[PDB]
Design a binder for this molecule. Structure first.
Ligand SMILES: *[C@@H]1O[C@H](CO)[C@@H](O[C@@H]2O[C@H](CO)[C@@H](O[C@@H]3O[C@H](CO[C@H]4O[C@H](CO)[C@@H](O)[C@H](O[C@H]5O[C@H](CO)[C@@H](O)[C@H](O)[C@@H]5O[C@H]5O[C@H](CO)[C@@H](O)[C@H](O)[C@@H]5O)[C@@H]4O)[C@@H](O)[C@H](O[C@H]4O[C@H](CO)[C@@H](O)[C@H](O)[C@@H]4O[C@H]4O[C@H](CO)[C@@H](O)[C@H](O)[C@@H]4O)[C@@H]3O)[C@H](O)[C@H]2NC(C)=O)[C@H](O)[C@H]1NC(C)=O
Ligand SMILES: CCc1ccc(OCc2n[nH]c(=O)n2C)c(Oc2cc(C#N)cc(C3CC3)c2)c1F
Ligand SMILES: [Ca+2]
Ligand SMILES: [Cl-]
Ligand code: NA
Ligand code: NA
Ligand SMILES: [Zn+2]
Length: 804
């Protein structure tokens, strides 16, 4: 209940939220149906429109006008944004040459440059180039400020998950807005875009920027605008707040446009109808910049022009129907569209079975435009699993398509030509970033980066300490002129042991055999040197990874590779090796097919054994440093050490062998040498974080050998490919993957074909940031390069997408 009989007189767009049942006058009151009786009259004036004309100049103030052109409007702070242009011979900001803003140029009483976040819904990255002719204001921000050619949104590429990621620096699984639609089973409550339900605090985790600012004594304008407030009024309100006195004035502001997303859904991303919406956004930007210019703030304010997601071509006829797949279609609930989420229709139905639903959805039709996953099997780069609101069964839908339950859902709900939501690496989903102002760089292009990184920089821009978040603070220092955040490398927690030869062959009873009894002071001093690390600068090119948790591990050196071997998990945490352009691939000799060799540096009790793999009918093994890439027949023996062995399902060994035999060498050819760091990942609780030993759900049968959920590789080389990977003077180039360790290749519909037809496709889908591998392993990579730490942080956030 609201006592709407109070008044908005002198309260229009007040910053405090007034408590029920007293009537509100804030930019949220419309959404709560709680505005005072006179809110529209007083706070939503429209009389005479939004622009000054010559004949209004020097008018007598008339308080009913939307905005003013009277001589007193500047001190009142309520001129039309074009007042100075029309009435005072000034130029529009867009017509002014851009000139570097070397220092903030702020009016007295401004303690720091204010930040204005201009957020646009559905603004696809390619609009910056393709619409540049109709967006002169936005083109000026982009060209004169700092811009990325695109910015990567988060999955799902939907509005609220992405806006709240911008706000919090968190993945949707952590902030809680995991879709525009959600069921929370703990609260037994549903989230929808309609009504006031979405406003309930329980949906929104983490700490958004406006709360971060408030808690630390920086005042914030309100980030949510009711849909019925016109954009001209949003801009006027922000400009009015900016003329508040010092003590009362916010330092951070947000504007929001529902366009171009609204039209894009109707017309498709490049419908001819889309030019108008783009012009209109540009005009709104021009209003803001003109208004800042009037207030003498245009060389003071940092402006961020930022999108939430793009827009793809999607039409009703491109829908897959679960009714064509499932017999039981009425026993499921489906969240539909550009992603699918499935759960049981009724939690009383114990004939519900995820295993049979998944199997009925898997490679059933030759052109099938979606792929089913248990959420833990989704590419780790998506970070879309660790929340009770994410259903176990997920459908990744091909770009340009929808999934729906039954045909009737689509015609009793073509009425649309655009949509978004797809995998966040899809080009049509990429969105925009431009920063303009004293703290941003001048005329600077920066590589694409992920929207999860922005919260940190927004905190930097405002002098705030960010709340714990998923950005990597310092990874975007290259966007900034000043206010950089200079992180230190984390300290190593566990120091390695360096074991020498400590065990005789006969102390081992591993049930392994090797035909290795095939054997000089020339060639033995040499082998000893290798085992002492004489070739380590070749194979360990960026220093040893630091272990950031308490554990017990051994550094093991070899001619061809170096490893950090965990006595806890009985396998390497990491294995590092360099493969030059000239390296040659060989096979595993016939006599060495089943060769496994005890490592005389490591006790029996801290070794795997071959009996375990013989007895486990589901589990085989592979090796981390590939025997195929041995530098000599004698070196090959090192590759068969029990300390280089890792448990692998036969199905996964298909993938791994092809990567090791064929791809590594292909990457070395193309990249002029690669350095490879490979290892296991244990994430049984799918939280994106290294499991502790007591979190492991599966072992090689009868043993203490833990089964990895994933295997990773980090493949580094010289960004200037004229330099070989092992003699690189400059910046580095990286690609990584985190391949799921699965007992079948059901994910790959073409997997009965030759590995050359499907394995690299799998790998690309499981592309990763080095940073994702750091979280999953507790390791810190690139500790010793000649590069700046911020640059290394940027490298670590890099994602190789394979989009064109
Ligand atoms: C991306 O960035 C974020 C932020 O840095 C990372 O998330 C952090 O990860 C930490 C580890 O997972 C986690 O730490 C835990 O905090 C628990 C206290 O939780 C509350 O307080 C925080 C701080 O303000 C708050 O943010 C939390 O908010 C969560 O929950 C609310 C309501 O449910 C949501 O609104 C909100 O969205 C958020 O949910 C998300 O996280 C939770 C987990 O917190 C998930 O359940 C959701 O799926 C969702 O993703 C909370 O209100 C604390 O209790 C934990 O401590 C346990 O474990 C340690 C082990 O060292 C031990 O000392 C304790 O004994 C304790 O164990 C006891 O409880 C166990 C579990 O019930 C039980 O089994 C034991 O027997 C014990 O009794 C833990 O320290 C931190 O909360 C989050 N922060 C956020 C914001 O999500 C994220 O990891 C990053 N991702 C990647 C990939 O890098
Ligand atoms: C850059 C970060 C950012 C910018 C703009 C944001 O909304 C802008 C917005 N106006 N009107 C509208 O329909 N939309 C989506 C935003 O989302 C929210 C902000 C607040 C607040 N305060 C509250 C909510 C939930 C719905 C109740 C969401 C957001 F996080
Ligand atoms: Ca984990
Ligand atoms: Cl959704
Ligand atoms: Na076996
Ligand atoms: Na298959
Ligand atoms: Zn949309």
């Amino acid at each position: 209940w609201t006592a709407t009989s109070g008044s908005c007189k002198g309260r229009c767009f007040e910053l405090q939220e007034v408590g029920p049942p007293d009537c509100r006058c804030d930019n949220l009151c419309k959404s709560y149906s709680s505005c005072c009786h006179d809110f529209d009259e007083l706070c939503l004036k429209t009389a005479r429109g939004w622009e000054c004309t010559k004949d209004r100049c020097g008018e007598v103030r008339n308080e009913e006008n939307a905005c003013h052109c009277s001589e007193d409007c500047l001190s009142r702070g309520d001129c039309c944004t074009n007042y100075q242009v029309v009435c005072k011979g000034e130029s529009h900001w867009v017509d002014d040459d851009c000139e570097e803003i070397k220092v903030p140029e702020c009016p007295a009483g401004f303690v720091r440059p204010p930040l204005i976040i201009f957020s646009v819904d559905g603004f696809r990255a390619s609009y910056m180039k393709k619409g540049s002719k109709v967006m002169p204001n936005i083109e000026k921000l982009r060209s004169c400020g700092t811009h990325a050619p695109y910015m990567r949104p988060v999955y799902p590429t939907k509005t609220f998950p992405n806006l709240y990621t911008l706000a919090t620096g968190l993945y949707p699984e952590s902030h809680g807005i995991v879709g525009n639609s959600m069921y929370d089973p703990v609260f037994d409550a549903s989230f929808h875009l309609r009504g006031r339900e979405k406003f309930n605090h329980r949906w929104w985790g983490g700490q958004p920027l406006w709360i971060t600012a408030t808690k630390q004594g920086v005042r914030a304008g309100t980030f949510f605008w009711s849909v019925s407030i016109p954009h001209e009024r949003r801009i006027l309100t922000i400009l009015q707040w900016l003329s508040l006195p010092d003590n009362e004035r916010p330092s951070v502001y947000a504007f929001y446009s529902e366009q171009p997303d609204f039209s894009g859904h109707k017309y498709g991303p490049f419908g001819p109808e889309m030019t108008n919406p783009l012009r209109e956004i540009d005009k709104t930007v021009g209003q803001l910049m003109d208004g800042l210019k009037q207030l003498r703030l245009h060389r003071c304010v940092n402006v961020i022009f930022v999108g939430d997601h793009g827009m793809e071509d999607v039409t009703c006829d491109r829908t897959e129907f679960l009714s064509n797949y499932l017999t039981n279609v009425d026993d499921i609930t489906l969240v539909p569209g550009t992603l699918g989420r499935i759960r049981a229709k009724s939690i009383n139905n114990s004939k519900y079975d995820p295993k049979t639903i998944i199997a009925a959805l898997t490679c059933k039709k030759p052109d099938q435009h979606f792929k089913p996953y248990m959420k833990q099997h989704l590419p780790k780069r998506l970070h879309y699993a660790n929340n009770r609101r994410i259903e176990d069964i997920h459908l990744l839908v091909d770009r340009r398509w929808h999934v729906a339950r039954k045909p009737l859902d689509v015609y009793k709900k073509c009425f649309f030509q655009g949509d978004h939501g797809f995998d966040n690496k899809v080009n049509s989903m990429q969105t925009v970033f431009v920063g303009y102002g004293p703290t941003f760089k001048y005329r600077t292009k920066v590589p694409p980066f992920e929207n999860i990184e922005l919260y940190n920089v927004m905190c930097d821009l405002l002098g705030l300490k960010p709340a714990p978040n998923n950005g990597t603070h310092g990874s975007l220092n290259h966007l900034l002129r000043t206010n950089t955040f200079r992180p230190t490398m984390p300290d190593e927690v566990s120091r390695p042991n360096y074991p020498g030869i400590m065990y005789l062959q006969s102390e081992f009873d591993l049930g392994c055999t090797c035909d290795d009894k095939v054997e000089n002071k020339l060639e033995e001093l040499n082998k000893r040197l290798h085992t002492k690390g004489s070739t380590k600068e070749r194979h360990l090119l960026y220093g040893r990874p630091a272990v950031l948790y308490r554990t017990s591990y051994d550094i093991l050196y070899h001619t061809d590779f170096e490893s950090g071997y965990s006595e806890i998990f009985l396998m390497p945490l990491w294995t590092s090796y360099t493969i030059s352009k000239q390296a040659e691939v060989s096979s595993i000799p016939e006599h060495l097919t089943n060769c496994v060799r005890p490592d005389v540096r490591v006790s029996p009790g801290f070794s795997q054994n071959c009996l375990a793999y013989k007895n486990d009918k589901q589990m085989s093994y592979g090796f981390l440093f590939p025997p195929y890439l041995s530098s000599s027949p004698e070196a090959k023996y090192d590759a068969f050490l029990v300390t280089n062995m890792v448990p692998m399902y036969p199905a996964f060994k298909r993938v791994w062998a092809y990567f090791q035999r064929v791809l590594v060498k292909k990457y070395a050819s193309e990249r002029n040498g690669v350095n490879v760091i490979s290892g296991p990942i244990f994430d049984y609780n799918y939280d994106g974080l290294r499991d502790t030993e007591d979190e492991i759900k599966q072992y090689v049968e009868g043993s203490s050998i833990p089964v990895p959920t994933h295997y990773y590789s980090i493949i580094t080389s010289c960004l200037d490919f004229t330099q070989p990977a092992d003699k690189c003077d400059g910046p580095l180039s990286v690609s990584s993957f985190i391949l799921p360790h699965r007992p079948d290749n059901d994910e790959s519909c073409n997997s009965s074909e030759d590995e050359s037809k499907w394995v690299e496709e799998l790998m690309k889908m499981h592309t990763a940031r080095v940073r994702d591998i750091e979280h999953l392993t507790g390791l810190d990579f690139y500790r010793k390069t000649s590069r700046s730490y911020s640059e290394i942080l940027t490298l670590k956030t890099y994602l190789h997408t394979y989009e064109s």
